[PDB]
Write a protein that binds this DNA or RNA. Structure first.
Ligand code: K
Ligand code: K
Ligand code: K
Ligand code: K
Ligand code: K
Ligand code: K
Ligand code: K
Ligand code: MG
Ligand code: MG
Ligand code: MG
Ligand code: MG
Ligand code: MG
Ligand code: MG
Ligand code: MG
Ligand code: MG
Ligand code: MG
Lengths: 80, 114, 177, 82
RNA sequence: UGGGCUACACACGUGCUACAAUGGGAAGUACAACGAGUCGCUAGACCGCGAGGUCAUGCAAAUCUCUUAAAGCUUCUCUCAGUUCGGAUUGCAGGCUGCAACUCGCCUGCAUGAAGCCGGAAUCGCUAGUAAUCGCGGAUCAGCACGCCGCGGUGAAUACGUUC
RNA sequence: GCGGGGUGGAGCAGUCAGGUAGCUCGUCGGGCUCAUAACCCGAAGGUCGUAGGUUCAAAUCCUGCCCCCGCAACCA
RNA sequence: GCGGUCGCCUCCUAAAAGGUAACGGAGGCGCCCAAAGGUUCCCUCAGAAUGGUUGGAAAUCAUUCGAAGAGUGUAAAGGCA
């Protein structure tokens, strides 16, 4: 790999803030916050709120109610 | 920042919240009341914990691309079913009953002198 | 190493069993990943290409090759050899790391994400994912980008059939529609 | 809008006609002058010829159309352009 | 019975609201007049964020009510920003009147937040409680005015002179 | 065959000598007028006949092509 | 006479060596490159199909097919993978 021409690349850990799913992968970005990891090593930690586990599509269950039928709206509206 | 929109820094917290899509001034006051944060402080002066509490309230709320998709879905629903309102949306004319002989520039667009 | 470990451990035995390969050598694998960013705006301002190149390098971790128009086309105000579009090639460990990050982080951050296509196969077991916009990769920082842009990520595998390629990609994690 | 206590509005004659056709394997066109009538789930799946001032324009009802007035789906005046 | 008079590539007249700090917003505090009221004006209380709803009170009225008017004044905030200016358009959710609110009513809440940075040639009203500006009542009226009629609050600049 | 030309609705610059598309009249809209004209204020209207080369860049340079105008197409 | 031409390069005429005329049929030249020269090393094209944001017939990307259908500064012939 050529020297001094590639963007600075470093290993980094990512944690899903919502669920805490963890994985170690390289990145160009660096995080001031660093964490430990199995094999007795520490790496910068880039916290993320949304990941595969958190994202609804990967789960297969949808957070949205999928809206209402108009007649049902009317049913609740006029008590019918 | 909060909902993916970098709200102004020096502005007061209520106004900076209003800069978020889907949130008006009344809604901003309500969410700040729930979070207990005073309305006068600037967002820069807000602590990290206050910001996180505000984030939880906003996430509980429905805003940004979610709200935009919902409104577009409603408008698309009208247009597809072919309602009078749908045709109004399609042709870019006032939908709420206004007269189109004059005015109507907001929907129509810039005047064409032809 | 996570995705490489996942492949060699889970995916390889699974594909072997599913497709009844006489020898392990037949196991399809991701040969390479080529990410291409087509910048026609370079003609108007080369700085657009420079920013796109900077974004791609940050996203990928490698300096991109600045492709050049093989032919001069008047339709696009294009002269042969103009540096329009860039690409990066990733193999082995860097390939695995970038693919894992794409599966986990970048794809969810896509606007209104309902998964990836299930027909973008050349017919030989090689796939391509057409990213509409950047800012989905965490390295972008969502602020440096003055102009939003997309890209095309071509995953080249040794799979002989679209079926085998689909199985490998799904097992590696691919939200097909 | 229409106050909640009042319920919906639907002209009794039109409502009676749709109810009569409810027990039908195949629906027949219902000719109405009642623009005011509100659409109902019972209306769903029918074809209603709504008078538009000079002729009964047919409209096929669906669960998306429910909750609106019939007259809104029958444009009154034609404007092709200039 | 239904629709149209409510159309809409455009042109003109008459107005309303704005483009902001002589201001926007929040709280507190003060001063009117002309008029209307019987199935009408509605007190008070309760419910509702609000439009309003329920119970209910007085008055055919210098007796009760509509009706504690708004500009104003005192604090607090905003700091020149297409914004905490602007309030069009739009989505949603509702209050009324009416047999009925889609064509096609008014109003309320949430959400959205358009043009607009003081306006070319030209052109209008006004000589004092006037212009400007702030509200209030009324007729028509089930419902519905930025219009009209009327009422009061605050309240100026200028007039050398008759060439045009 | 010899020349002259293709730029806004019309007529003309700009072409030689490469950078930026203009003048006049006309048209549309609004003013003034009792009304028209004149006058005043706004606006529109061409990617320069067309297709390729040269250039960093073409209305401009090069090549061809298509149109329109004038002349010629045979002399003892 | 008028028009055209006058020197050099390429093709056909040219009759399978060479050469061969006409006011015969077609085109070019009066340069260009400081690399577009030399050498060492290395590489193989044009198009098509399929898939893929802007992106459209056609910009860039990937697999496959593809013996030259490309390219070779500049006319043609010859030659060159
Ligand atoms: K109308
Ligand atoms: K008007
Ligand atoms: K007029
Ligand atoms: K008005
Ligand atoms: K103030
Ligand atoms: K109506
Ligand atoms: K009234
Ligand atoms: Mg907001
Ligand atoms: Mg109206
Ligand atoms: Mg009638
Ligand atoms: Mg009328
Ligand atoms: Mg300003
Ligand atoms: Mg006088
Ligand atoms: Mg011979
Ligand atoms: Mg010979
Ligand atoms: Mg050579």
């Amino acid at each position: 790999m050529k020297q001094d021409i590639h963007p600075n690349y470093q290993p980094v850990v990512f944690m899903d803030s919502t669920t805490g799913f963890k994985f170690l992968s390289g990145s160009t970005k660096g995080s001031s916050e660093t964490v430990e990891w199995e094999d007795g090593n520490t790496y910068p930690l880039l916290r993320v709120e949304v990941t595969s586990d958190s994202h609804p599509f990967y789960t297969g269950r949808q957070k949205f109610t999928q809206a209402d039928g108009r007649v049902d709206r009317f049913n609740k509206k006029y008590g019918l | 920042r909060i909902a993916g929109v970098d709200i102004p820094r020096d502005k007061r917290v209520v106004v900076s919240l209003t800069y978020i899509y889907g949130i008006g001034n009344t809604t901003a006051k309500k969410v700040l009341a729930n979070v207990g944060v005073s309305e006068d402080v600037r967002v820069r002066d807000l602590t990290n914990e206050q910001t996180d509490a505000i984030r939880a309230e906003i996430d509980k709320l429905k805003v940004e691309g979610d709200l935009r998709r919902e409104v577009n879905l409603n408008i698309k629903r009208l247009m597809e079913i072919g309602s009078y309102r749908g045709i109004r949306h399609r042709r870019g004319l006032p939908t709420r009953g206004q007269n189109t002989k004059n005015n109507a520039r907001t929907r129509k667009g810039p005047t064409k002198t032809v | 190493n996570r995705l490489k470990e996942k492949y060699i451990k889970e995916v390889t035995p699974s594909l072997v069993e599913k497709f009844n390969y006489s020898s392990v050598m037949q196991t399809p694998k991701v040969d390479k990943i080529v990410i291409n960013m087509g910048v026609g705006d370079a003609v108007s301002n080369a700085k657009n290409l420079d920013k796109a190149v900077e974004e791609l390098a940050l996203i990928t971790g490698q300096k991109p090759l600045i492709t050049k128009a093989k032919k001069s086309i008047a339709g696009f105000r294009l002269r042969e050899g103009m540096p329009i579009g860039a690409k990066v090639t990733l193999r082995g460990e860097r390939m695995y790391e970038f693919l894992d990050k794409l599966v986990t982080v970048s794809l969810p951050r896509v606007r209104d994400f309902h998964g990836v296509s299930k027909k973008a196969f050349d017919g030989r077991g090689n796939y391509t994912l057409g990213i509409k916009e950047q800012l989905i990769f965490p390295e972008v920082d969502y602020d440096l980008v003055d102009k939003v842009r997309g890209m095309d990520i071509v995953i080249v595998t040794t799979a002989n059939t679209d079926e085998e390629s689909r199985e490998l990609l799904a097992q590696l994690g691919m939200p097909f529609q | 809008g229409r106050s909640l206590k009042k319920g919906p509005f639907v002209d009794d004659h039109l409502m009676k006609k749709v109810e009569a056709q409810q027990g039908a394997e195949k629906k027949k066109v219902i000719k109405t002058w009642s623009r005011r009538s509100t659409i109902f789930p019972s209306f769903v799946g029918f074809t209603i010829a709504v008078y538009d001032g000079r002729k009964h324009v047919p409209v096929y009802i669906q669960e998306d159309m429910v909750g609106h007035k019939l007259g809104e789906f029958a444009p009154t005046r034609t404007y092709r352009g200039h």
